[PDB]
PDB file of C-alpha atoms in Angstrom:
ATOM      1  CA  UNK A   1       0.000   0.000   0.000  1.00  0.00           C
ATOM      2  CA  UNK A   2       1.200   3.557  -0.498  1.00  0.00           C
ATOM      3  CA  UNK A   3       0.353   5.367   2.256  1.00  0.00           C
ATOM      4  CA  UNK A   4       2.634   8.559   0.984  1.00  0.00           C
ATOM      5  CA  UNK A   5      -0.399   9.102  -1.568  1.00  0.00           C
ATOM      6  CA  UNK A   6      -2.305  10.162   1.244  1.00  0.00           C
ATOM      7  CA  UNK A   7      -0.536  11.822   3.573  1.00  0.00           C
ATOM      8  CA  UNK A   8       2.929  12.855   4.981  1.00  0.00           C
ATOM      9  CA  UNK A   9       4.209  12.579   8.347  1.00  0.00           C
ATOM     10  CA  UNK A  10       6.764  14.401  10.672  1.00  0.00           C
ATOM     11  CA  UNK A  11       7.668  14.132  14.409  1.00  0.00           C
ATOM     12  CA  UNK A  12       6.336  15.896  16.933  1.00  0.00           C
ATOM     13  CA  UNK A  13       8.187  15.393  20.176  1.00  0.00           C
ATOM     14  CA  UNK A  14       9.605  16.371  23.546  1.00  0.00           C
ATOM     15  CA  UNK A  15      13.517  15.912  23.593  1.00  0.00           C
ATOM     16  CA  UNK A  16      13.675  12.333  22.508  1.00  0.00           C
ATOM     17  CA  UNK A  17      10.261  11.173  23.090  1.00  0.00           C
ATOM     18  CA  UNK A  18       7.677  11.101  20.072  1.00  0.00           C
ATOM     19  CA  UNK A  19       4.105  13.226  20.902  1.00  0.00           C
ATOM     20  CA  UNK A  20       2.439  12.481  17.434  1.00  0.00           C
ATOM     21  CA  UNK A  21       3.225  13.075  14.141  1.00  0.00           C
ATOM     22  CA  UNK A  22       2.003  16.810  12.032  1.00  0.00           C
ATOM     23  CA  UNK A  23       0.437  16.123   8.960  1.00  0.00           C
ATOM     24  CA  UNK A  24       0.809  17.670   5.459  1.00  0.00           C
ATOM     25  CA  UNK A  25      -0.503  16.886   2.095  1.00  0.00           C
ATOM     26  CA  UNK A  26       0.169  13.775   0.515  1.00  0.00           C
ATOM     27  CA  UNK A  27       1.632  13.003  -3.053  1.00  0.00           C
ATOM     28  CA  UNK A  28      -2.142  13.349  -4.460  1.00  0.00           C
ATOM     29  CA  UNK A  29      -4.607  15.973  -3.898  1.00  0.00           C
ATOM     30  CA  UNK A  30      -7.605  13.796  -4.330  1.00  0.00           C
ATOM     31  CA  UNK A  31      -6.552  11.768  -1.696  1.00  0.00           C
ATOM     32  CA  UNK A  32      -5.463  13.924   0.869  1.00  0.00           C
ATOM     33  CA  UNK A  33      -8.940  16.146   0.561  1.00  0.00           C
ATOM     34  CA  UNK A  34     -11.770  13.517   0.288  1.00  0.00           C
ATOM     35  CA  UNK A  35     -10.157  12.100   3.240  1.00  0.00           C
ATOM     36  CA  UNK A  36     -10.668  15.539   4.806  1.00  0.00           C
ATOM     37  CA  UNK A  37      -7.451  16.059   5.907  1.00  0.00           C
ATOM     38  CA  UNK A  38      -6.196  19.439   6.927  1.00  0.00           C
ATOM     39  CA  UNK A  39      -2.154  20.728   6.737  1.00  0.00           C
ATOM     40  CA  UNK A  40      -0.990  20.955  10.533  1.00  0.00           C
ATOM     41  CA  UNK A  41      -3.264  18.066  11.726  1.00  0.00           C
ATOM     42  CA  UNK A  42      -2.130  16.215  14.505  1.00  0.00           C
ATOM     43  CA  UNK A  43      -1.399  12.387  13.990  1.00  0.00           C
ATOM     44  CA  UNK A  44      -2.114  10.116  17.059  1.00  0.00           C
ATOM     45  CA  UNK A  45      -3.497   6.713  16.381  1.00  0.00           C
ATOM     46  CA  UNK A  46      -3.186   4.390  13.668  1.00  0.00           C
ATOM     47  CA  UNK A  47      -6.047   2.119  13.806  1.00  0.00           C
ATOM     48  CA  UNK A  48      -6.528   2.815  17.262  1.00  0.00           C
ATOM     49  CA  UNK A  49      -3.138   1.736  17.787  1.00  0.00           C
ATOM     50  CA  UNK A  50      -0.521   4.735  19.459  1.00  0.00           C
ATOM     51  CA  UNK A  51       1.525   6.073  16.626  1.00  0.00           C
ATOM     52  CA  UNK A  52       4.602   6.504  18.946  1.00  0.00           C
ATOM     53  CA  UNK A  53       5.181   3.162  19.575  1.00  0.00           C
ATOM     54  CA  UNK A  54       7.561   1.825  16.834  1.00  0.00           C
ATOM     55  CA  UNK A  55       7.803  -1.485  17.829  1.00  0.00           C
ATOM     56  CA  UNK A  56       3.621  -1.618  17.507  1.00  0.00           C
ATOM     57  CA  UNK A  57       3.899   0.381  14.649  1.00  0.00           C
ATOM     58  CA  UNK A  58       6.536  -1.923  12.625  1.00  0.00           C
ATOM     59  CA  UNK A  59       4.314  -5.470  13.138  1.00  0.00           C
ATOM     60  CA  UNK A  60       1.281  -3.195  11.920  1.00  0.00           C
ATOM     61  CA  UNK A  61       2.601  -2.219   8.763  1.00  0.00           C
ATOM     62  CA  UNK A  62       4.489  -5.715   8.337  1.00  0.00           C
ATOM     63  CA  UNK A  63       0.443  -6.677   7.954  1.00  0.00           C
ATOM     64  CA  UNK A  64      -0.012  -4.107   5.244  1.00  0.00           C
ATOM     65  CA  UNK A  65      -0.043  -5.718   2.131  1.00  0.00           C
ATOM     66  CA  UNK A  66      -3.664  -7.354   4.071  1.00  0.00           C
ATOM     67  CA  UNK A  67      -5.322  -4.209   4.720  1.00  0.00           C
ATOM     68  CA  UNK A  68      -7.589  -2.692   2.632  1.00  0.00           C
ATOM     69  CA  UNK A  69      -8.567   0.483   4.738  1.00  0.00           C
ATOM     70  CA  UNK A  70      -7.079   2.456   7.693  1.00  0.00           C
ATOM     71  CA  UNK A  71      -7.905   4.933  10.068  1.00  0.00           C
ATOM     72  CA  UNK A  72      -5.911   7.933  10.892  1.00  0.00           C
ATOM     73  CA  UNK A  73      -6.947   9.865  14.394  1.00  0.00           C
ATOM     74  CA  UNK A  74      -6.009  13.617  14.646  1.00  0.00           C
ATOM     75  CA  UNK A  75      -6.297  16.408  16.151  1.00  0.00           C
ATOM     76  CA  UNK A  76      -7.469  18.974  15.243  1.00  0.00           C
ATOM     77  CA  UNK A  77      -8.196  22.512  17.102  1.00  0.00           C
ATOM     78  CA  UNK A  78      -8.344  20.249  20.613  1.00  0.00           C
ATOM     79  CA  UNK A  79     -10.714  17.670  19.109  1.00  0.00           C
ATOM     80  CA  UNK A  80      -9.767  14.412  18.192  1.00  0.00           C
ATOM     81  CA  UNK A  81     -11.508  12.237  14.729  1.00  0.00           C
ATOM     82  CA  UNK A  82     -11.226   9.588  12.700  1.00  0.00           C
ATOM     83  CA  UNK A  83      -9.870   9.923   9.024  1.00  0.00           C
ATOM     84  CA  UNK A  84     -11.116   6.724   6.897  1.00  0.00           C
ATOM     85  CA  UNK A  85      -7.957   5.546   4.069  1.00  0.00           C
ATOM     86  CA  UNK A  86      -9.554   3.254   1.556  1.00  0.00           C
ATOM     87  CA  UNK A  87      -6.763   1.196  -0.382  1.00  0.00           C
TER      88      UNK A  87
END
């Protein structure tokens, strides 16, 4: 799957711990808009799994290839939602 289509990622954190990860637009427009994502969203969970855990993170997308959807929580302006990927 090619998540970079969609959207990318950078750290957010505090010294040398990871908060989240800010989001800006992915490779395609489409994408990144009908998913109603916004530049300077806040990344936090990755199908309800904590995006700052690597180690979680790394046997998720070792599963990828299976998925056909995702969900992306932000936050945005102190509130928190679900963004729905479709692969």
């Amino acid at each position: 799957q090619e998540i970079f289509q969609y959207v990318r990622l950078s750290q957010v954190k505090r010294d040398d711990k990871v908060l989240g990860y800010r989001v800006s637009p992915g490779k395609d427009p489409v994408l990144f808009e009908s998913i109603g994502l916004q530049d300077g969203d806040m990344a936090v969970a990755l199908n309800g799994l904590d995006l700052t855990d690597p180690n979680v993170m790394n046997t998720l997308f070792q599963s990828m290839n299976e998925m056909t959807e995702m969900s992306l929580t932000v936050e945005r302006d102190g509130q928190q939602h679900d963004v729905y990927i479709q692969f």
